[PDB]
Amino acid sequence: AKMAFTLADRVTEEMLADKAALVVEVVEENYHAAPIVGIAVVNEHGRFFLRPETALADPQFVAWLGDETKKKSMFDSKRAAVALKWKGIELCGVSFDLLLAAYLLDPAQGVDDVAAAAKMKQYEAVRPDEAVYGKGAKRAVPDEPVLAEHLVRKAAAIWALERPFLDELRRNEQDRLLVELEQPLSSILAEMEFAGVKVDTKRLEQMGEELAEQLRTVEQRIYELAGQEFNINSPKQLGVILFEKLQLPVLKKSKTGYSTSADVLEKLAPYHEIVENILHYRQLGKLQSTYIEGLLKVVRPDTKKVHTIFNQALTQTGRLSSTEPNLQNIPIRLEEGRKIRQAFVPSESDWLIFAADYSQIELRVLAHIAEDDNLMEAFRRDLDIHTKTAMDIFQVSEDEVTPNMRRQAKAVNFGIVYGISDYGLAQNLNISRKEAAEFIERYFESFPGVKRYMENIVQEAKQKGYVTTLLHRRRYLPDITSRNFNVRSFAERMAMNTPIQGSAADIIKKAMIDLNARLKEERLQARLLLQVHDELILEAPKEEMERLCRLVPEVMEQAVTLRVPLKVDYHYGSTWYDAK
DNA sequence: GCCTGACTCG
DNA sequence: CGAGTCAGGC
Ligand SMILES: OC[C@H]1O[C@@](CO)(O[C@H]2O[C@H](CO)[C@@H](O)[C@H](O)[C@H]2O)[C@@H](O)[C@@H]1O
């Protein structure tokens, strides 16, 4: 059954109402330098479909888009705006992003189109996108008539659904979160994505040749030791060589076969020389295949930059995600791997790279919400939390605490943050469940408030059906009452874990809002590039480094006021590698 | 076209 | 506990 709409051949003064539901269709998954297949407006005067060539040539339309005084309602506006920036066009005045409104209501729904968002309010008038454009190889843009109806139907939805969603967000006390946090942050992400991060490709290609060389050296050693050749990247194949051919012990079996995960390979090391080499191989293979090669083919030959997409509405906790490529997971922990970060340089000559990161933010978040006295005091004095923890559970003095002790006390801390599993803590520290429990038991004695919180958060999450972060983000946990022990336990952990991970998310996001404003006031050329959950990265002129040092941490540290101080450590340098 | 297994970062 | 990317197997 048709929907009435005008397939325009020219822009009109009634298409430019000061409030409209706007659709700008980008079908490309990666919207950087990707085409715009159609436009559609819906407002008090009617519904119109515009062809991009027509719309995006006209001053009145292009002016309306950019006009902040004209209000747009959209679904996934960041997509559009970033896409428009690649054509030299500002998209402003967007005052309601439906995708964001759905994500806040229930992160679990996996809302990723207008239909998905729509179904949530018993609106079935619009088809899903996967339905219209197909999937994979046969994926295609249909003929104008089919397309035009669809775009209008989404616009129609967005128009119809705005008020209803905003009503709910209100009821939840999430109206401010959407309007004053998630929506603005979206603008900033759009600037960060479009800005991109400059890559020194020749550096990487050099590293490529080096890594390649060592691989052939290492791999060849394996065939020598293995007594034959085989595909080392094949789990099944390797398993045959190790567990059958060389007769090593089977310490763990994966669901489909044998586990060759590093943790296992470590224990097998003493038995045969080959195990150590496979480990060396994997890290060398990983750096090469993913971080050197995978990185190279996602650089635009024009800008010589990498432009990631930050998925803002995907995570269950309120965190961000990074894709094509994921810049949130570039190796740091191991030095050989870390040097890859050398290929990440400033955009403009005589500029530097700046990094600002929170110190133990998740644990600071815990002290506040949990109201543990021993935790707050520790942080108020700015102690090393892992040593302190270590001191309390072993009943020792700093002098007594040894590196192994700190490593363990740390595990408990990350465990305590990640929900509490003896299985997990034992698996992690390589010990018996009965042990991990004695640790956890002694922990709760050291921090009775942190215990009390874990109890209450599970009980509230049961009584309410969800848990809320510091800003009023939400995660529904229906398996909290499940009769299955395992299923119930996972939700239990999430119950405890989510207000931490999400509140840490909330703060960094708030920081960014404040950070942008400040950068604007000071008229600094310093710009945000990346965010990695607990840290931000900028690039500014060498001349600005001294003011940033005073500004960036303060704004981060002042984002919110907790019962403990926030602590921001910073670093700058020529390359990303040198920001540390 | 998906799933798996291993490994990368917070 | 969150995420994402590659190879191989199917
Ligand atoms: O543009 C990000 C936005 O798009 C969604 C779909 O609504 O995800 C699509 O695009 C992502 C980035 O290109 C892909 O990772 C994903 O596969 C694709 O569905 C949302 O998830 C996201 O908020």
XYZ file of C-alpha atoms in Angstrom, chain A residues 359-360 363-364 373-392 397-399 401 406 413 447 564-565 567 569:
35
model
C 44.942 6.738 35.970
C 42.976 3.730 37.226
C 38.686 1.634 40.336
C 38.189 5.308 41.195
C 36.332 4.101 53.074
C 39.546 2.141 52.608
C 39.326 2.690 48.836
C 38.735 6.454 49.007
C 41.476 7.057 51.526
C 43.850 5.112 49.254
C 42.938 7.302 46.289
C 42.835 10.525 48.287
C 46.500 9.821 49.053
C 47.160 8.775 45.447
C 48.694 5.437 46.410
C 49.431 2.690 43.942
C 46.154 0.849 44.265
C 47.648 -2.525 43.358
C 50.364 -2.334 45.982
C 47.864 -1.027 48.550
C 45.426 -3.813 47.689
C 48.365 -6.247 47.788
C 49.283 -4.933 51.261
C 45.761 -5.409 52.612
C 54.070 -3.714 54.513
C 55.078 -2.005 51.351
C 58.567 -3.286 51.897
C 55.184 -6.525 48.776
C 51.423 -6.945 43.067
C 41.314 -5.722 41.169
C 36.901 -3.449 51.533
C 37.948 10.825 45.036
C 40.229 12.870 42.781
C 44.131 11.784 37.923
C 48.786 11.642 33.199
